[PDB]
């Protein structure tokens, strides 16, 4: 598909603007736009001094769906801020990489509920056998929120 290079430049630049609302908007923008040139800059936005900015940059990388950002996202799951680590989960379920199956299953056990909920979807999205596998094991090794999820997938998915 086609990406307006004028805006692409602008927004990747704006990613290092003094104002945070600016660089927050640049994240959302570049996610929708979906250009490969924004992936690298967005992983470096993933370490942004501001949390809300880190946060978008995450889902932004999810939207763009490039397999490059899988690892940095997995590391971003461990972010201090929970909201950021939630959107990182969601992002990883979008990309659909199997490499996020474990770190997501680990997040089903996260302290914050939204982050537990995010992962749930994300895994549900990725699916297939390597998910179906870890789910069947979790119906026994798991407990509480996480356990409730495992059974629900094995209910729905084959």
């Amino acid at each position: 598909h086609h990406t307006d290079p004028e805006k692409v430049e602008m927004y990747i630049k704006n990613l290092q603007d003094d104002s945070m609302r600016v660089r927050y908007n640049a994240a959302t923008a570049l996610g929708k736009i979906g250009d490969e040139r924004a992936v690298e800059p967005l992983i470096k936005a993933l370490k942004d001094e501001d949390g809300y900015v880190r946060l978008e940059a995450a889902e932004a990388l999810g939207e763009i769906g490039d397999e490059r950002a899988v690892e940095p996202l997995i590391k971003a799951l461990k972010d201090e801020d929970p909201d950021v680590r939630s959107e990182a989960a969601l992002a990883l379920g979008k990309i659909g990489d199997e490499r996020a199956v474990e770190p997501l299953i680990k997040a089903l056990k996260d302290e914050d509920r939204y982050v537990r909920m995010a992962a749930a979807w994300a895994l549900g999205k990725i699916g297939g056998e390597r998910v179906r596998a870890a789910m069947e094991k979790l119906a026994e090794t798991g407990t509480g929120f996480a356990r409730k999820v495992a059974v629900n997938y094995l209910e729905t998915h084959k």
């Binding site: 609302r21 959302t28 929708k32 501001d50 809300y52 939630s86 969601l90 509920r113 939204y114 999205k125």
Partner: protein, 227 residues
């Protein structure tokens, strides 16, 4: 689906809300029209009870997802349309980061041939010098993704998302939305694989209207599945 046939052109819309936030009673009502062919929603909502105790954005989400533009290949996943015209029930719980929380119950259905949303809101724990009760929020909205996932156990969907409300001279007040929808009638409905929706909303103000109001321009368009 039989529901989707209804939304083929432009369909008029109506919304009514009764709310109570930390005691502050109020009610909102709105009128407009929606072309699911473009995912477009265009409406005007007004506080009937004079002044609104909260900032308009909070209520956006609670105050129709049947007008969502589902692509051709994903047409099997529009639970909302499928549930019509009998309609569906949208129950939410909205935790504001470092502030209070809402509980809502909406009844979204077709009346004659107008889409109608009837909501019943309950707010608690909201800080008085909070952003909500302190009206510290900008008059605009962001693009968000609404994460959808079927509920085999019940017979509908668990929806979840995290709204980002801009502060006037500040960052962002978050809002974890925990949603759940369920059908009104007993008809058969589509239950979808995990996908999401991509929203674009615009807030504006009519100069001629003197009441407490909001002018909304939405564009929900579904994404996720691939074929």
């Amino acid at each position: 689906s039989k529901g989707e046939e209804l939304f083929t052109g432009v369909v008029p819309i109506l919304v009514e809300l009764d709310g109570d936030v930390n005691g502050h009673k109020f009610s909102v009502s709105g009128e407009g029209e929606g072309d699911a062919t473009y995912g477009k929603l265009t409406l005007k909502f007004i506080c009937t009870t004079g002044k609104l105790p909260v900032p308009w954005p909070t209520l956006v989400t609670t105050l129709v997802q049947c007008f969502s533009r589902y692509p051709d290949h994903m047409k099997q996943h529009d639970f909302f349309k499928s549930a019509m015209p009998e309609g569906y029930v949208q129950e939410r719980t909205i935790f504001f980061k470092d502030d209070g929380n809402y509980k809502t119950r909406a009844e979204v259905k077709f009346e004659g041939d107008t889409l109608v949303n009837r909501i019943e809101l309950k707010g608690i724990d909201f800080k008085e010098d909070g952003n909500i009760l302190g009206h510290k929020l900008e008059y605009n909205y962001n693009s968000h993704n609404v994460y959808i996932m079927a509920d085999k156990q019940k017979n509908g969907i668990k929806v979840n998302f995290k709204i980002r409300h801009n502060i006037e001279d500040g960052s962002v007040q978050l809002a974890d939305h925990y949603q759940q929808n369920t059908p009104i009638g007993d008809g058969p409905v589509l239950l979808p694989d995990n996908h999401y929706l991509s929203t674009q909303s615009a807030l504006s103000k009519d100069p001629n209207e003197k009441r407490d109001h909001m002018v909304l321009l939405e564009f929900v368009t579904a994404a996720g599945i691939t074929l």
